[PDB]
Structure 1
Amino acid sequence: VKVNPSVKPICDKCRLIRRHGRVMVICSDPRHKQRQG
């Protein structure tokens, strides 16, 4: 994952969810995974 306080979607099919009380970006491309930290 990428760990930054500013996460946001990169491509068309990145999705921004909130699991376990943290904002993260799940995507099919593995280098687009991000979570806030």
Structure 2
Amino acid sequence: MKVRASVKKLCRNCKIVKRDGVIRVICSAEPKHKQRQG
């Protein structure tokens, strides 16, 4: 989980999700590629 202000889909498996306010990226193929706006 990375700390960002820009949460971009870096690959096809990356998935943008808004979990009750906080904008997040989760990638199925890559454990690195998951991100968080904070």
What TM-score do you get using the length of structure 2 for normalisation? 0.82
Greater strand share, structure number: 2
Unmatched tracts of structure 2, length 5 or more: none
Count the aligned residue pairs.
37
How much identity, in percent, do the aligned residues show? Answer: 54
What TM-score do you get using the length of structure 1 for normalisation? 0.84
Over the aligned positions, Cα root-mean-square deviation in angstroms equals 0.8
**Which ranges of 4 or more aligned residues in structure 1 deviate by more than 3 Å?**
none
Greater helix share, structure number: 1
